[PDB]
Amino acid sequence: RLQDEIQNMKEEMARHLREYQDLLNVKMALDIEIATYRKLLEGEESRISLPL
Amino acid sequence: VELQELNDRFANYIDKVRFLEQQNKILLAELEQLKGQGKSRLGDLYEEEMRE
């Protein structure tokens, strides 16, 4: 009873930090893709506007 | 530039609509765990009070 839930904890919690990190890795990948878009679309709005 | 200020007033009126919805959305999120779960967690607690 102690080992199954302290291991469900130890495995879940080493996953939850990584699962928040991977929602934040999707947010990071979106930040790079949104840069590659922004430096061209808002980066032709550039000649009114600009990028990063 | 009154045609362009009309798009920029579309953005500043879309800010005003984004805030209209999001000040409702913060208020729905800061409430919905006090409403729906706000009855199910109250039966969840009354059966602990019933257990002792």
Binding site: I34, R38, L41, E42, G43, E45, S46, R47, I48, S49, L50 | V1, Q4, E5
Partner: peptide, 22 residues
């Protein structure tokens, strides 16, 4: 984030020059 401050006067002086050709 797209864009800031200025696109008007480069768009306006052009669309003004098109309207001003007529």
């Amino acid at each position: 984030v797209s864009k800031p401050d200025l696109t008007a006067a480069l768009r306006d002086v052009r669309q003004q020059y098109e309207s001003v050709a007529a």
